[PDB]
Ligand binder design. Structure first.
Ligand SMILES: [Ca+2]
Ligand SMILES: [Ca+2]
Ligand SMILES: [Ca+2]
Ligand SMILES: [Ca+2]
Ligand SMILES: [Ca+2]
Ligand SMILES: [Cl-]
Lengths: 347, 347, 347, 347, 347
């Protein structure tokens, strides 16, 4: 994730111009290799036309260039590209919204699971750790960065998210499918035990805990579903082929023809195809943004910071349910007890 | 479902190029027959023009080709195609999101339905089996793969989702409509019985169970509704006719005319209509993706894996509510009890 | 509703081609009269130009035809048509999703309203009948098919949805607005009475019943709102005028001019305007789909089957709450008690 | 609101043609003045060109007309207009969905607030009146029609929505912001008092009442937010300028030039610019629909009927909670106790 | 926020024309500098062509101008601009909807937290102050205006949102991440303490309080997420480059060429490029609206009034939970106890 929100707080004279000088998470970084390859192929073809082909071969090549220039518009590059990019971007934001967070669960646990002794601390910490463990399992299933951080369940145990006994129970479970849900069932069982023990004082509190757990588990399952159901491969292949074929055609149709031949619209020999290069930049860059966003759990610059989120979530949950439990400041009267540096359209 | 999420984790130099070599769930697989038919018809027309027609017939054919080329643009192929494909894709993702899953219900049941003896196991297993049976019934109603797996209710009984006594009750019910909902009413009655028996310990737990059951049943009903209310047949017919008529016109208008006739824009005889073939590839491929996604419960490569989901859901639910019930590891202090391989825009 | 989901389960070679042979709920059925009128007017104008007008009149007519052909593009037919059709289609699916269904309510009632005697049956049946009656009232308010089935409240009473005493109470209520909500208030009062009587055993059950009732009543109210707030009449008039004016202009601009006059682009006299007819087919068909879908409660082939839904809902609700109440099969061990015909991207 | 749903129940031969004869809430009503002004300016320019300018001035004017005709396409009228209209229409439907309705609250109150004596009637009536008063306050804040009906809080008191004592409390509250929320806090306090008094019999009933109150208050707040956060003024100014500049350019570029000058595409002098007038009609009408819908609480024909809704809501709420409370017909066996005028795709 | 809802209540003859005279929050204010720079560069190039270049240099410049004019269309300015602006506008409205509001929480607190003595006042005021403090913390994290108002936590303490003891607890918490959530955990702990003390009378009331708290905290977290996950920098760079390159090309291609050279379409020398300036105005203005809306928490005229909202929310919450608690007017019979200044489509 490359954040630039602060730079664009206000619309200024050189507002978006300053952002053109950024390299990390930039379009130049994503596309310079492809732009170089396109320019090299175009230059090779141009040099062959200028210095290799004979006069008759040059005449035939000019006819072919005119033909390609006139008929390359038949490829609906923008038609397919726009739909594909819209689908990818919508999926991208939806996937970000599906990353589980323990904030609601930690607030509920701090408010509902009680006891200042070691057993109450154990209950709260274990519930939050079960939530975090389920999140870690799903993330290592769907994210390459998290998987690299946790290439085995032994790594998860050493990171403290799972214990050795929990590891034994986890591995002894006979199931050929992803087990990211197991900590959620552990959470349900532990919450039921706490309610039966009196640590959770009422049935409404247990119900709220279970509802928060279901929301968390649903976000984990949504992450799994997004990982499984990719964007249809047909769409990806179609857009890739459209872009590739269009610019392969432009390699010929956008060639500078000899101005002495009087061809319509071929009157200025600029050598470098500035506008063809700009069009390639824009279209290939659109597709490259789609490529980067299609799997936002990779290791691109603009991909989600899943490891940072794991660390932050675990730290915050443990703090909230252990250090902050029943640790309020005395009720004091505030500043305005005795009371800077629109009413409507019809009023 | 053809998953390629891992291949596209990062935006690489040859990122989407590698995906062009996939056959299963590809555009080539879906469209090679149609492309071959179009090319064969075009080649037949070209050969007839080149070797059969007389000089005057050729002149008239050239006039007709020019006429078709100039007036085939009147058919709004992209206008209708884009709207149709957008509608189909939105319905496709919505339908996937409507497939029932027992995860929330299994967590609630493991947390709320109690008893380590045979009766408690029976309660939990039967509740999860009722959910799974309702899902199986709706899926065999709407999915051809599931129906092939379960062509009769006898198959459902032999698969273990229904018992013989439940089968008798199910068949004795006098109703001419789909009975996918019957297991949900069984679930409600059984949950009420468990609460009255004391297995469910509080009214809040029963309420949460019923809410989860309603969510599950609502997803089943949404699957039924999507199966019933197809995309309007008028739209399908209109898009099919638009594509067919446009490319039937292109069969004539895209013909290579004799360059010796001096016709504007007919100067190079390439024989093979490369760009016409590419345009057909793209437009027909867009419509073929729509065709494959319109009913995502068929047997296409990219259709949903409903049988796999049935098996996974049943296995996971049974495991969670039977083997994992009240089977927690002792409360142990975690690694960080005593405590790898951004704050905001204004900070 | 014309359902063709099964025909399109798989993407086949002749996939959407087979659907072109359907008449009921087809584009041909909706548009053949208009296509015939357009063709007749075009043919009348063509015959007048060919056999009536004098040479000078023909020259002026040719000038007018060229003028109309060149300036008819100024009418943004697709621009307005696409937005209108998108709005109509979104409203159409939303309206279908707003049709009330008693499934959630029937499950809750079967689980919460108790008693195997006559009084308990009366309670459950009356609650479900109140829901069904409210749905019937709203549907006869908004649907022409339902209104034809129930042209008076006497018809509703004879259909069994309302009793004579309930009819007296309903008619004695002094209100000038639609009374579809009255059965919902009856439902609330009856549920409160049942809870006070002990038939509903806990306050949570009553709360769940009231929440389900509110969801049902909200769907009824949404149906009322969609019926009341039509698509803005300005949009309908604008799209109708755009289509009509565009094709009235095409009646002149698309005329076949005498090829002996050497007019640019008028070189082939085909008599029949194939592409103009195809363009009219597509655009007028788009508008006709909008026309059919704008009020989906009419009597079009693709309109919702409201009477079928009323019958199905009443039958299923009565069955679920009366015959299926406390009618479970004994708890039996299932097939897999002792245990056919993907893990992630990083795995 | 101009409702025409019944007229469009079925797709008929003259389906949308009949709607062209409606005046109230029509495009003609909204746009005839602007169309007349455009036509008058065009005619003035045409007369000046025909009868005032000298030959050399006419030649320069013809050059300017050709220049304007060719370069007026640079203004992206449709590009900005479509986005603006889509935004406005989405906001319009969202705003309609945000108008508070007392139906859910009245059902809950009739089911939960008890007592057939004067005190129970007082409780129910006062709760519903507090909801209605909050709605009235917000509506008079955001709607010009409601404000005209209630130009002062004295008008609200005389309408019966507020009492004199409540008025004293309302005015004594020291707050410089809109007070539409005050009746909701009164509702919360009164519901708490009723629960403490025993009129509300359980804590779940009070919770459901408070949840319904929060939904109602949230809709009121959404109305306030929509009133406050207008569509960005930049967008409105940009679209207005685009339309105005485009058609000011068309005033010159669409002029009929002398056919004797042989200018390309200027061969027929029709005097009246039929297609330019039609294009203005369509584009200006699109913007006028946006103008009418941008604030749907004004006094346009198609604006929401806020006063009617206020009256209906108050009448229905009072009826439901006072006359219909505990006023059920005896439990009678229905018609079908002893039992007119699809199963799936795979079946 | 520049509100103009009242000005546009009705569609009038000079409806949107009046809005063109507004300066604050206008397009002119945002874009006059850029328009001036573009005009100055164009004028410099024009003067150089007219008075500096030699005849041969002028011929080459004319060729280059024609080349740029014909090939500048290859840059898909509108294609990228529309998608970018749509994304930005959707994010803008979503971000506004995510600003936390205490209305629901204040209603719940006034209805559930009881006691007319000093301790009850302390409880209610402290709960609402915790909500407001969490909102202030997140807003100063994401908003530059709020941060300027509260550049340090000392400023927050002096504003009365935090106490000195709460400040000590807040700073002693060992966490490297944003602490906006800490007041929410304080709220949970304080609500639990109040319930244990009897101030909250039932478990359902505590559950409702915790649910409202979770909604509030979720909106705060959504604000944080929107601040963190910016619009992809690739999209911003691509749109900026597209606009800049297109209008840099127009600087040359839109030059007025010497009419004596007989160049096609260069016949009228107007000196000032009116339509090029209008096109720049529209496209650059679209991008400037995107720039202003991309971070709606800056200090633009149309940015959200976060400080006003903070003040209003605190004042209203304190009033509702302190002055308005248990402060109802006696239950009086209303005006209509004894009872101004549509039924459906089928009726
Ligand atoms: Ca990626
Ligand atoms: Ca399929
Ligand atoms: Ca209809
Ligand atoms: Ca209005
Ligand atoms: Ca800003
Ligand atoms: Cl609840």
């Amino acid at each position: 994730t490359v954040t630039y929100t602060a730079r664009v707080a206000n619309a200024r004279f050189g507002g978006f111009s300053q952002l053109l000088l950024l390299w990390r998470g930039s379009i130049y970084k994503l596309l310079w290799r492809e732009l170089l390859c396109f320019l090299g192929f175009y230059m090779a073809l141009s040099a062959a036309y200028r210095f290799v082909l004979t006069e008759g071969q040059k005449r035939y090549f000019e006819k072919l260039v005119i033909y390609c220039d006139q008929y390359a518009s038949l490829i609906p590059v923008s038609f397919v590209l726009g739909f594909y990019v819209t689908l990818v971007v919508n999926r991208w934001w939806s996937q970000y919204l599906c990353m589980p967070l323990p904030d609601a669960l930690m607030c509920v646990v701090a408010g509902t699971v009680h006891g200042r002794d070691d057993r109450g601390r154990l209950y709260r910490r274990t519930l939050m750790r079960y939530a975090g463990l389920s999140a870690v399992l799903i993330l290592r299933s769907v994210s390459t960065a998290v998987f690299k951080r946790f290439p085995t369940i032994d790594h998860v145990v050493e990171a403290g998210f799972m214990t050795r006994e929990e590891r034994k129970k986890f591995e002894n479970l006979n199931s050929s499918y992803n087990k990211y849900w197991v900590p959620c069932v552990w959470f349900s069982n532990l919450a039921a035990q706490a309610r039966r023990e009196g640590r959770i004082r009422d049935n409404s509190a247990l119900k709220l805990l279970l509802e928060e757990l279901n929301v968390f588990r649903g976000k984990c399952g949504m992450l799994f579903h997004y990982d499984w159901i990719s964007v249809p491969l047909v769409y990806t292949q179609v857009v890739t082929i459209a872009l590739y074929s269009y610019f392969l055609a432009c390699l010929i149709g956008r060639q500078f023809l000899d101005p002495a031949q009087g061809y319509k619209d071929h009157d200025l020999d600029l050598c470098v195809p500035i506008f063809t290069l700009l069009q390639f930049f824009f279209y290939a860059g659109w597709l490259k943004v789609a490529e980067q966003l299609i799997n936002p759990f990779g290791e691109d610059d603009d991909d989600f910071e899943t490891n940072f989120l794991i660390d932050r979530n675990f730290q915050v949950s443990m703090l909230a349910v252990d250090e902050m439990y029943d640790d309020l400041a005395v009720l004091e009267k505030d500043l305005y007890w005795d009371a800077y540096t629109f009413q409507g359209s019809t009023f």
